[PDB]
Amino acid sequence: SRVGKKIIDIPSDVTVTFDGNHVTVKGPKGELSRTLNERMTFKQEENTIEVVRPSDSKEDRTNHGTTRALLNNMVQGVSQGYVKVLELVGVGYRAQMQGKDLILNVGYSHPVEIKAEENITFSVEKNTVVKVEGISKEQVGALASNIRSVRPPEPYKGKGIRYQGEYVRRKEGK
Amino acid sequence: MKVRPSVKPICEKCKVIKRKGKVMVICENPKHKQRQG
Amino acid sequence: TKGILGRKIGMTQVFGENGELIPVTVVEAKENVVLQKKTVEVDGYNAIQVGFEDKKAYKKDAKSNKYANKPAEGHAKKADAAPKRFIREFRNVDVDAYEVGQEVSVDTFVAGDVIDVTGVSKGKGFQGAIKRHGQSRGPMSHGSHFHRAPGSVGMASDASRVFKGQKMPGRMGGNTVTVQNLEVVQVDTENKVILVKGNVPGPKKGLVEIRTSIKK
Amino acid sequence: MRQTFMANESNIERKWYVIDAEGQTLGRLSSEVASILRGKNKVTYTPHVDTGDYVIVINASKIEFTGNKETDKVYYRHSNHPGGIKSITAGELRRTNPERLIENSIKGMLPSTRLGEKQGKKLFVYGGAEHPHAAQQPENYELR
RNA sequence: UUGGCACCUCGAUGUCGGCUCAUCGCAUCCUGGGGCUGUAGUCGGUCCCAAGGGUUGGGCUGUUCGCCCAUUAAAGCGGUACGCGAGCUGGGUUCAGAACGUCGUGAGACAGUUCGGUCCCUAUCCGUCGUGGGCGUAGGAAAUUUGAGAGGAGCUGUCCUU
RNA sequence: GGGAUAAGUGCUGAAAGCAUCUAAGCAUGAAGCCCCCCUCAAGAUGAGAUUUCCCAACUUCGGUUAUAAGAUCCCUCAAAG
Ligand SMILES: [Mg+2]
Ligand SMILES: [Mg+2]
Numbered sequence A: 001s002r003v004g005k006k007i008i009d010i011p012s013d014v015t016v017t018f019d020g021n022h023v024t025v026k027g028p029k030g031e032l033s034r035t036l037n038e039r040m041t042f043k044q045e046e047n048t049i050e051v052v053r054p055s056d057s058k059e060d061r062t063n064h065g066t067t068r069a070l071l072n073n074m075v076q077g078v079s080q081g082y083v084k085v086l087e088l089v090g091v092g093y094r095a096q097m098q099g100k101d102l103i104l105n106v107g108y109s110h111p112v113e114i115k116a117e118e119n120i121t122f123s124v125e126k127n128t129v130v131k132v133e134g135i136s137k138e139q140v141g142a143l144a145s146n147i148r149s150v151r152p153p154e155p156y157k158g159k160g161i162r163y164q165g166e167y168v169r170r171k172e173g174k
Numbered sequence B: 001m002k003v004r005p006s007v008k009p010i011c012e013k014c015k016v017i018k019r020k021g022k023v024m025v026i027c028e029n030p031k032h033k034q035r036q037g
Numbered sequence C: 001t002k003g004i005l006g007r008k009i010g011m012t013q014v015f016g017e018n019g020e021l022i023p024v025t026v027v028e029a030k031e032n033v034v035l036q037k038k039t040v041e042v043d044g045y046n047a048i049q050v051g052f053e054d055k056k057a058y059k060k061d062a063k064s065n066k067y068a069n070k071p072a073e074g075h076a077k078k079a080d081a082a083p084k085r086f087i088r089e090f091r092n093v094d095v096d097a098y099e100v101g102q103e104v105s106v107d108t109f110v111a112g113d114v115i116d117v118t119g120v121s122k123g124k125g126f127q128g129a130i131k132r133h134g135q136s137r138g139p140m141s142h143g144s145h146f147h148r149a150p151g152s153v154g155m156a157s158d159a160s161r162v163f164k165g166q167k168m169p170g171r172m173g174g175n176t177v178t179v180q181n182l183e184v185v186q187v188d189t190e191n192k193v194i195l196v197k198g199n200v201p202g203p204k205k206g207l208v209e210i211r212t213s214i215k216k
Numbered sequence D: 001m002r003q004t005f006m007a008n009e010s011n012i013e014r015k016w017y018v019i020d021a022e023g024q025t026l027g028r029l030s031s032e033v034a035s036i037l038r039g040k041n042k043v044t045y046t047p048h049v050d051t052g053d054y055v056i057v058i059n060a061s062k063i064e065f066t067g068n069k070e071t072d073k074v075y076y077r078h079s080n081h082p083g084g085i086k087s088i089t090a091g092e093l094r095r096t097n098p099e100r101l102i103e104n105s106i107k108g109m110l111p112s113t114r115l116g117e118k119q120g121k122k123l124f125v126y127g128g129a130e131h132p133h134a135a136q137q138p139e140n141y142e143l144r
Numbered sequence E: 001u002u003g004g005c006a007c008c009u010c011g012a013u014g015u016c017g018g019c020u021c022a023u024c025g026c027a028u029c030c031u032g033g034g035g036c037u038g039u040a041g042u043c044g045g046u047c048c049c050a051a052g053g054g055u056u057g058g059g060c061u062g063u064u065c066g067c068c069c070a071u072u073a074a075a076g077c078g079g080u081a082c083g084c085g086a087g088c089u090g091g092g093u094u095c096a097g098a099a100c101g102u103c104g105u106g107a108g109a110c111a112g113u114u115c116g117g118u119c120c121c122u123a124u125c126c127g128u129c130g131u132g133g134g135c136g137u138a139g140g141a142a143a144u145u146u147g148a149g150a151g152g153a154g155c156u157g158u159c160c161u162u
Numbered sequence F: 001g002g003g004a005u006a007a008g009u010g011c012u013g014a015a016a017g018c019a020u021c022u023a024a025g026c027a028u029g030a031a032g033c034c035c036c037c038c039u040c041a042a043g044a045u046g047a048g049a050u051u052u053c054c055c056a057a058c059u060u061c062g063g064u065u066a067u068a069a070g071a072u073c074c075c076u077c078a079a080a081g
């Protein structure tokens, strides 16, 4: 696992604490705690961390790559955070913020409201762009997916909620 | 989705994968999406 | 959530605000008292036990259910109440809202309350499959020797038996029935009468249990 | 000459044992308990009498399965009514009624006889670590 | 399904269709959830999941079918002795009468037709539906109950608004 | 309405520096499943719970006894049959 072999460089500000299998990572933006694979062994240096796999068995190899990535994501997340941007397309499609919660109008009789989650921030620009910001890459990804799911992009005109950098296949209706 | 005993790449982009013990083909082209069954 | 015990008196009609004819059932729910409060601690569940309709006190050589037996008299006395003909538990109500020996009034319910009425349906005795299970008759003419019979009760060698739940002649009625989403048209405090819109199960003089509707 | 000893109620002594189900495979625990209940571990074992000992199983909720049994092992029961087949998974049974899971497992390893039913009644199973049979003064038993 | 075979039944395992009562499978007719589309929308096509419930009345014919009229969300396909005659019918078929065509010298004959033509049984056991008595449930009782289980229910249209 | 799911749809994610819904992990998802609703139900021989009622003399000291609370016979009946 080349991914597993690659060391994670701890930012000077960020501090990583390992308790048994569980690891708690503290950074300026937030603190993230997760449980890594038991078999994997972690070597910690002041400026870097190395994950070590006990055996070359597939199971150990698979977990090694995953474990490294999970730890890397936590460290990066606390340091810089992760943000996903979604852009509404089509006339009359607008996004607005009701306190923490986000309100979406997407060609439905009912307005759609997405509640904010802990360690997540919802921000809207121009009422056509929504950005989800959080320490956890997964949490940002999940909420972005939920927002995108409210109205997925249509093929013919591209109308819908889409990721900013997403590509949509286009078809000619008539 | 195409459900068939013979699941194979239709184009160069098609990728054979296994999900939940099932041979499947994933592709940018939706038509080439396949699941063995 | 509220509950009361009453006797069905009969049916009548009331004219609504817009002059619509409202079929109603008159229930008399006098003499309701909370005999006991069941708790999770002692009983494993919370309920109020309500005794309805006073019965005569214990006598030495009582030959009928009109006079309270010594066990019954004691149970009622613990609530400081007269012995009761009918006793039922209400699990729907909040136990805290009630105290033992408290009278439960008809005024607990108010007009427009949606209620479920529970009672034992009228007995019909031994009844055939047509009336009991609403089956079709056989032909009355054209050579038919099949009129009110139940029909085939099975198949052949595969199953060589009748399945459980085959519909056959038997005793019909006298079953507990709950009619849901009925409405309290009116409450008469003076006569201790609750007017329930529509009809409820059982003969006149039958026991009815009125509860706040489970579905809301 | 006929000299074989025969155990009878007068000479039979039944003991009480506690077995912890925590970290034990269901079947392997089950097979061992079945032998204890049937008196197979006694030198005075006699077929037509119950020479077995009472068994208390604790922490039934913590019994373990191998492979995908939790979802793929299904218990089927019929009500004797047409189409009356009802199924719950072993995993769900463990969550909801762990005592039944253990009890049915052991009873299925006991003979379907009047004696076998009696021997199954000597089994007491509890999902938690606490049992109410302290008066019986049960002895801890370690599975071989 | 049409057959092949001739293994249980010839000291009898009643046979078509309908009626009554169903019950099960899912290769799903409708309704629910999806993928792909040569999917603009409205509609469709095709495939996957799904058996919870639902799945109409007539004309003709003994009919099963099938065609037709009018509907319906839909008018599903199969198994259960082509389910069910000690539950019903008895129109067809499969006795004795008679006739036509036809064949036969004839007596007669015909998966050709035509008309007429006896459907028995007081339920012992299991099974099923109801309804009591005994004993048990470590004293004898009266009331009120928990719910391990088990059964039931489970369908859809149209219109208005957006 | 709730919980868990199907076909699906994903998020994060390596084996496999990419990619990938899956392997670890995390979501979402049917008239279906388990409930929610209705009815029966402790012969549930695993026979459960609560409240109340009854509680003495004899005796060979083994136990018996009619009586208690209670319930029936019999009788007048119906909302029951
Ligand atoms: Mg091909
Ligand atoms: Mg009819």
Ligand SMILES: [Mg+2]
Pocket: C144, C145, C147
């Ligand atoms: Mg007649």
Ligand SMILES: [Mg+2]
Pocket: none
């Ligand atoms: Mg031969």
Ligand SMILES: [Mg+2]
Pocket: none
């Ligand atoms: Mg014979």
Ligand SMILES: [Mg+2]
Pocket: none
């Ligand atoms: Mg299928």
Ligand SMILES: [Mg+2]
Pocket: none
């Ligand atoms: Mg037949």
Ligand SMILES: [Mg+2]
Pocket: none
């Ligand atoms: Mg027959």
Ligand SMILES: [Mg+2]
Pocket: E090
């Ligand atoms: Mg005939």
Ligand SMILES: [Mg+2]
Pocket: none
């Ligand atoms: Mg012939």
Ligand SMILES: [Zn+2]
Pocket: B010, B011, B012, B013, B014, B026, B027, B028, B029, B032
């Ligand atoms: Zn392709």
